[PDB]
Design a protein around this ligand. Structure first.
Ligand SMILES: NC(=[NH2+])NCCC[C@H](N)C(=O)O
Ligand SMILES: NC(=[NH2+])NCCC[C@H](N)C(=O)O
Ligand SMILES: NC(=[NH2+])NCCC[C@H](N)C(=O)O
Ligand SMILES: NC(=[NH2+])NCCC[C@H](N)C(=O)O
Ligand SMILES: NC(=[NH2+])NCCC[C@H](N)C(=O)O
Ligand SMILES: NC(=[NH2+])NCCC[C@H](N)C(=O)O
Lengths: 155, 160, 166, 155, 155, 161
DNA sequence: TGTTGCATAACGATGCAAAA
DNA sequence: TTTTGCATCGTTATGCAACA
DNA sequence: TGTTGCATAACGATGCAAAA
DNA sequence: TTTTGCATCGTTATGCAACA
DNA sequence: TGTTGCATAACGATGCAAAA
DNA sequence: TTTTGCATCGTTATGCAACA
């Protein structure tokens, strides 16, 4: 029942049991020989990298050891990221009234359009993408003409 | 404007927004940043929300108390699956017909409803589905072997 | 036609029934609501004329006189081709609106609605059927809808309507 | 005699009033001088071509005179129609298992895919369209190979 | 003479070899008995209809004999073509400001929208298609109202 | 006085296909001229690299040798040849989230909206073992042609980034 | 049927003292 | 010098009732 | 890592003279 | 009368370095 | 809040007799 | 010879309660 030897037995338990909470982890260890208290397990999981992952509607969650690196890749970034994509797949800029008209390679529309929404520009009312064209609605007083050139200057 | 909504649709979309561009490490903290927009809700629902959103409190700070992150569509959380409570709702609201062929399950919906339903299915991340793909009034659900298309169709059927 | 024996298993709700209704009215000569209830029954779909009336009323179906004498047939306007002359329709749009509407905003003659991912097209469809006289038409992406207000109505004005209507 | 001068006054009433029912049409005529009974109005509207149109969720409906020709163009046809479209915009046919893979000109996918659904082929489980590609799922025992060639033979 | 018997042996070589260049075609013939020079082969391929086809990212290319007729069907035409499609699947025209609103049969949107882009109308800033609706952005001074009626007059 | 094109491949290429479609280009240097006629100055070196990635072919239209340039229209890939990975491999390591399979199907996942973009590069690749593709928003279905299997395709995409 | 607040149990991280 | 347990309190989950 | 220009080799079409 | 080779020059491909 | 059945009023088409 | 009204009955709409 060594200290560093206990954690190696925890890893195995997790990779074959839906461990709900730390209490139930004391049990899975208890009936297994090794016996500890909730407080200390919280410490092991801490340094063991383990986390409490769950499905999209999977209630409480389960403790599991992260594999490759990051267990979850959450929602994308902001402005600087859009700038990079923008320069990568922006074909042409144009405007008409409060409207800015972006043209992209076939199918690339939605991807770029999303990156734009992500940046949450205060001067933008929202976007709509087709296949090779995006409409960017500017909010008063800002004009589509402005946005048009605006996108240009970070392509 | 933009004038957010006074419902789950509005609040949730607003929730993911914040958690994405901020360092939220506690549910009550979220309730504060929401209040900072005229969005007042109790921690009870917030718990019910980011649980339906599939949000996880990953330890970013090298010490216990970590941050909140919401898995980006297309990149479901590796390891877990759970999620039906909602899919079951939309399923009894949008499902027109179930049918199958081979390892494929063919769901039908009203016009335009295709993508919406499939999204809830993707979040459900069912272990027996490899993934989904939607058109306008049709969804294809790829059953992962040895599970069959017929079998999937059955599930969707008696689950509404 | 659709049975779990040799075909697609229809649903036990409005979604399923309605989609099945339009199907029949399209490939058949239905001239009475009770007749519809029969052809539906012929598929294990049993419903009363009360709801059928509520259904094809929400579907925007009309009893056009095809037979040169009074008693005509039923037809459901094809999306993109709304009925010319009338507009009415909110009861449903109002429902989906309070369920899918994330945010309302505007600019010029445009009203910008936001929805959850994928919900864009679904909502816009209910709006198209509503055929509001002050909207020229709609167009949806994935999480965004553009509603073109017809002059002199303004984008701001439309945004307001959608707002307090949920 | 007079019976034909009355109908000309009915046309005008309709083009400027939300006439709900035939009773309320007797009223609109009554307070206007001309007076008749429900039974006969049913006859006038009959031969006048008038119909009771309504919005998608517009409740009861209103009597109106059809303009150009047909007031409403309802849901499309069936098999023979698909055949026409099919020959018009089908680029290539192929298959793999229970799957038939149709290729169309850019964007034409959804249109053709719809025409296919309309035909409601008993040997088809449903379709899904992208931009220039459609997937047609065949139902056992029918194979995608069959459908593939099937489409070919009516292009 | 023998000149007509050599080409028949070239056809076969091509239908079973990735012939990169004409030099390597002299070799494939050389070690086969028949021997000629680069200059003359250029002439044979010329009248043999053969062409140098290649994949989308398939480098140099390969000589192959066209089968049915045209080996490649390239990007679509221009204005007169759009006119044909336009009359075929245009449900209704309308406008609001610099915007023209086209309505099509379900799913037909993207197809027609593409044909419009193809015409590259100088008075058009670009288009965006949904399912049964297209938005056509006019460029100043041209108004959506103009475009709206413009489309009408070639339906 | 019009749409302001871009100063990159995205802009130039889209502009290239435009010209080749509505014109009779019979030489690469000629293209460089018509491009220059729009403030688009590039060397024949890249133009060669461009219309090679576009899959353009110099088909003999004029009854004599010197023919014109045509770019195959999406949905109508060139019959006979396949080649094309250099680009698909790029987008693949940039947009591919996860690979999975089932039966004759390969299921690729991408970020939101990226689905169609990736699938397009795959379609142009015209791989002999793929019958075709179809994309949603964050998912692509790749139909492997027998005897090739879905699992097999998944593998390829995997170790190719 | 779907949703939210309230009040309470369930659960996890950490200071501080004792033990190996 | 370090590790574990105790005890505490910040944090998250849920039965239940109210309401629409 | 992705891209473009430069300079150079690789490659293909054609006039002109000799050969079958 | 036609066909092939020589030689030439317009056309296309690429190693390499520069640059971001 | 969304939905469906039940029972009832609202509504429209038609046979048959009287009126212009 | 035709047109309108009466009266009837097939057809469609809805308040209300039950239920989820
Ligand atoms: N699917 C296509 N190839 N469409 C071509 C035209 C696209 C249209 N302008 C849009 O972005 O909506
Ligand atoms: N209204 C339409 N766009 N119909 C075409 C799409 C139909 C096809 N079953 C799909 O869901 O992809
Ligand atoms: N995942 C996505 N496809 N996002 C696109 C969002 C913006 C896009 N213009 C729309 O119509 O909503
Ligand atoms: N123009 C495009 N977006 N092409 C993408 C093609 C992807 C796939 N073959 C589909 O039809 O969905
Ligand atoms: N089947 C549908 N998606 N219908 C809704 C269409 C929404 C909008 N009118 C568009 O064309 O984009
Ligand atoms: N934002 C969305 N459209 N989500 C639904 C995605 C459904 C399916 N995975 C697809 O890619 O088509």
């Amino acid at each position: 029942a060594n200290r560093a030897g206990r954690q190696a037995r925890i890893v195995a338990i997790l990779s074959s049991a839906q461990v709900r909470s730390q209490n139930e982890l004391a049990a899975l260890l208890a009936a297994e020989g090794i016996e500890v208290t909730q407080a200390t397990l919280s410490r092991d999981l801490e340094e063991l990298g383990a986390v409490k992952l769950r499905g999209a509607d999977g209630g409480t969650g389960i403790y599991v050891v992260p594999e490759d690196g990051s267990p979850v890749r959450g929602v994308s970034g902001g402005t600087d990221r859009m700038a990079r994509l923008l320069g990568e797949l922006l074909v042409s800029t144009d405007d008409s009234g409060n409207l800015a008209v972006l043209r992209t390679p076939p199918g690339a529309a939605h991807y770029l359009a999303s990156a734009i929404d992500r940046a949450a520009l205060p001067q933008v009312v929202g976007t709509i993408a087709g296949d090779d064209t995006i409409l960017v609605v500017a909010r008063e007083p800002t004009t589509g003409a402005q946005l048009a050139g605006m996108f240009e200057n970070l392509r």
